[PDB]
């Protein structure tokens, strides 16, 4: 029931600051997840559907963000790289289900939708389920940056360079990620 607002959101957020939601003591139907649509992708790692009749609804978080089509299959357990070590990392654990559907004409315009970003330059790659906020310089090597963004030390974010004439794997896929736990 309560996660029909997470699918039609006019604006999602970038992967360097996504948005969880503690879902508390309510009915979750779970039959709107399977038999939802043919063009959705429904990889599930933790537990299988048509089994989840348990009293599971103890703060189920539904992550949501937006990435490239060739970058959807980085979000799996393990699978290190640029967006799964510095932005948003999954553990080798009870992550329930990951859904990824295509945003063909919701944001992809010809001058570029600029509010989608990803943090490419980060020291000490992430712990699982960790969110980053700060926008300071990376300090890769030598001389300390008191903040000018001068040399050998980069701005931590990066833009996204939208255009409709991209490939199938670079037009954005709107991705949501659930979570399962108990008390």
């Amino acid at each position: 029931c309560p996660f029909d607002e997470v699918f039609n959101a006019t604006r999602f957020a970038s992967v360097y600051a996504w948005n969880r939601k503690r879902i508390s003591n309510c009915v979750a139907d779970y039959s709107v997840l399977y038999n939802l649509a043919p063009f959705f992708t429904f990889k599930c790692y933790g537990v299988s559907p048509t089994k989840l009749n348990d009293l599971c609804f103890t703060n189920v978080y539904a992550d949501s963000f937006v990435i490239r089509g060739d970058e959807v299959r980085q979000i799996a357990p393990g699978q290190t790289g640029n967006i799964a070590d510095y932005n948003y990392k999954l553990p080798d654990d009870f992550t329930g289900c990951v859904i990824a559907w295509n945003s063909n004409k919701l944001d992809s315009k010809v001058s570029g939708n600029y509010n989608y970003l990803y943090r490419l330059f980060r020291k000490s790659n992430l712990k699982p389920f960790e969110r980053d906020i700060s926008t300071e310089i990376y300090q890769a090597g030598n001389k300390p940056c008191n903040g000018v963004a001068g040399f050998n030390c980069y701005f931590p974010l990066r833009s996204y360079s939208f255009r409709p004439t991209y490939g199938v794997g670079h037009q954005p896929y709107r991705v949501v990620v659930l979570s399962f736990e108990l008390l």
Partner: antibody
Amino acid sequence: QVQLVESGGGVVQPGRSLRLSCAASGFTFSSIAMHWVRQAPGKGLEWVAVMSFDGSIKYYGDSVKGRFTISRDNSKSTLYLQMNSLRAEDTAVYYCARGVQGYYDRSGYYNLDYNYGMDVWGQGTTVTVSS
Amino acid sequence: QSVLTQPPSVSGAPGQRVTISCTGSSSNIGAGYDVHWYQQLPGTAPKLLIYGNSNRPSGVPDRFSGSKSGTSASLAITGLQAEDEADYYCQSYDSSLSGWVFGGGTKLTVL
């Protein structure tokens, strides 16, 4: 840390059958699938076998079908590969390569993830058919 | 033999852009399944280079790119040094044999 060792190099006559053994060290062995690939010296790689999370689902290539069997043990942290009726072409190094975690499809059908590739590889040992 | 065709040896001058094309039939890329890339020095085991047609694991630089266009994929390296003169293989999954078939195996050089 994460690495894979293996054993079972051989010198093999016309008619023989053989078993391979690849241990695992460092990571969660009981969850991720496992792949076997081989490479004849002079040519490239060639996929051999795969076995799922529990062992219920296995697949085989055309050059190895009918003569090959597989098994794994989460207890001793080992992976096995027994091989029947070794013919006069299969002299190669044999890699045991870590796959990717399987996933659950809609309507409750467990199956392997077919998109991904093999992340971390062992060393490989060389069976040698001969005369 | 080999299922996926790629050229056996492609040369290279330092500082250039070198392509490695891997053509597969309409049953491994035509079903939508992905094309990967590996990196094998002689005397050792390969390492994973590109998975999911455009991604890269932790360890490889920014110069290793790839794509997937229809029934054929390609890899490109820009600003190559003398460190990488090893072989590269393309891997996909089909439904003609339901096996994880490879490519023929190219060969790169540094001049």
